[PDB]
């Protein structure tokens, strides 16, 4: 502990240029959610599990949400990370303390139904969505059958 | 502060249509495993670390297992998630309470020796496995050398 | 609970061949870091968050570090995992106890400025970096604006 304790104090106080390092404490790390796949989307009949972390400064900062169930989507990556305006920090992002967990989950449900070509987290899936939509839908349906449904 | 408790009550009793939100309590979250790379597989020289999480209603739901070590394989992704029948619920999947941690780890070891081309979690890797096999095997050997600890 | 303890006993005493289990005892898991995007790189004006885990055997094994903020780079994957010599053990790697958390964070910052096409975790990005650099720089800039920029 002597090294680590002192090491951490040196990083807190005299870090290298462009670098900072601190401790956080989440309010809650064991919250989970489930979203049903929507009618008239390739995720229909699938059930999708998610992780919801409530960070230290909620509701001033947004919940931190990743998909646990795999999903084939241009805005959702191999690690389940999600690109969405209401999940991004103010002032540039759309999160505010006048929204809540329910509204962000409803926004993720909407995203599943309305993928956004301008916000790629998965460049290959985004390219397929743009230039060969029938192939994208086939793949999205198969992944839903394999990993969700 | 008190908001969150109230918020969760409201999510629990009256959620949005198609959405549910609840609290999980894992039986154990710090359990680890290690699988030695198999003979006559491209993973031979490596050792592979995994995390094993035991959920609240085990053994009625399967263990939640992810590779911590990077591995180049069509059925395993960058988060270490694993597409395998014994890790999925019936009727589609093969989990039942007559299986256990030891048997599912053995099943994952067999999956490492026998990849499945129809169960993809990484699109480029699956395609390459089926259509450009020599490139797959070269990449799998190189990833073992560069990103796994050597045996 | 009784079932789980019985299983852990059996795994400790008579595991399947090639497979072992144990419980990790990390020194620390709640440490966070931040790297400012470097001047004269495509990551300029981005702010990048990272997770730092300090394992049981630090400083004789390296710290375990990944990006939480998405970044477009040949040596960093979709889960934020980082391919870098000082994060790996010898003989293949360069971690030694004379290094520390601060120097490794500085090495990650240097890696951002100087990608390494020998060690690709992202094959498509590595090819773009080698053969179509203006397109690499343009895409790295766009990803920075979309996922890492705060004003
Ligand atoms: Zn984003
Ligand atoms: Zn690709
Ligand atoms: Zn699957
Ligand atoms: Zn590596």
For helices B123-131 and A123-131, angle between their N-to-C axes, nearest 10 degrees:
80
Q: How far apart are CA A36 and CA C121, in angstroms?
A: 33
Contact B87, B95 (CB under 8 A): yes
| A13: phi then psi, degrees, rounded to nearest 5 | -105, -40
For residue B8, how many other CB atoms are within 10 A of its CB? 17
Structure determination method: X-ray
Report the side by side order of strands in the sheet with A64-67.
A64-67, A47-54, A28-36, B19-23
- Nearest Cα to A71, choosing from A63, A82, A84? A82
Nearest residue of chain A to residue B8 (CA atoms): A101
Pick among B49, B78, B149 to test the C interface (most C CBs inside 10 A):
B78
Strand positions, DSSP E, A3-149:
19-23, 28-36, 47-54, 64-67
Tell whether C90 is within 8 A of chain B (Cβ).
no
Tell whether C146 is within 8 A of chain A (Cβ).
yes
| A7: phi then psi, degrees, rounded to nearest 5 | -60, -45
For residue B67, how many other CB atoms are within 10 A of its CB? 22
Nearest residue of chain A to residue B21 (CA atoms): A33
- The top-level CATH class assigned to C1-151 is alpha beta
Choose among C54, C124, C150: nearest Cβ to A4.
C54
Beta bridge partners of C23: B31
Tokens of A52: 């919801």
Contacts with A7 from chain C: Cβ below 8 Å: 100-102
Q: Which CATH superfamily does the domain covering A1-149 fall into?
A: Ubiquitin Conjugating Enzyme (3.10.110.10)
* Length reported for chain C: 151
Q: How far apart are CA A40 and CA A57, in angstroms?
A: 38
Residue B51: CA atoms inside 13 Å, Cβ hemisphere, count?
14
Q: How far apart are CA C108 and CA C117, in angstroms?
A: 15
Question: DSSP letter string over chain B?
Answer: -THHHHHHHHHHHSPPTTEEEEE---SEEEEEEEEEPPTTSTTTTEEEEEEEEE-TTTTSS--EEEESS----TTB-TT--B--GGGS-TTTS---TT--HHHHHHHHHHHHHS--TTS-SSHHHHHHHHH-HHHHHHHHHHHHHHHSEE-
Q: How many interchain CB pairs under 8 A, A with B?
A: 76
Q: After which residues is chain A broken (C to N over 2.5 A)?
A: none
Chain B partners (3+ C-beta pairs within 8 A)? A, C
**Which ligand is the nearest neighbour of the Cα of B142?**
4
Cis previous bond, B91, omega within 30: yes
**Neighbouring residues of A73: CB distance < 8 A, sequence distance ≥ 6:** A111, A112, A115, A122, A125, A140
Q: How far apart are CA C99 and CA C106, in angstroms?
A: 11
Q: How near does any CA of chain A get to the CA of B122, in Å?
A: 8
- Environment class of residue B98 by beta-carbon count within 10 Å: exposed (0-12), middle (13-18) or buried (19+)? exposed
Subunit contact B150:C77, Cβ cutoff 8 A:
no
Q: What does DSSP assign to residue C79? A: T
DSSP, collapsed to helix, strand or coil, labels residue A50 as strand
Q: How far apart are CA C44 and CA B82, in angstroms?
A: 36
Contacts with B16 from chain A: Cβ below 8 Å: 102, 105-106, 109
Question: DSSP letter string over C19-38?
Answer: EEEEE---SEEEEEEEEEPP
Q: How far apart are CA A28 and CA A25, in angstroms?
A: 9
């Amino acid at each position: 502990a002597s090294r680590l304790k002192r090491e951490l104090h040196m990083l807190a106080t005299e870090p290298p240029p462009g670098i900072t390092c601190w401790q956080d404490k989440d309010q809650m790390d064991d919250l989970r959610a489930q979203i049903l796949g929507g009618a008239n989307t390739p995720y229909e009949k699938g059930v999708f599990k998610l992780e919801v972390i409530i960070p230290e400064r909620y509701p001033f900062e947004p919940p931190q949400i990743r998909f646990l169930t795999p999903i084939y989507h241009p805005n959702i990556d191999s690690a389940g990370r999600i690109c969405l305006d209401v999940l991004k920090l103010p002032p540039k992002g759309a999160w505010r303390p006048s929204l809540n967990i329910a509204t962000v989950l409803t926004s993720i449900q909407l995203l599943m139904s309305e993928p956004n070509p301008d916000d790629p987290l998965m460049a290959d899936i985004s390219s397929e969505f743009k230039y060969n939509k029938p192939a994208f839908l086939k793949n999205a349906r198969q992944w839903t059958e394999k990993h969700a449904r």
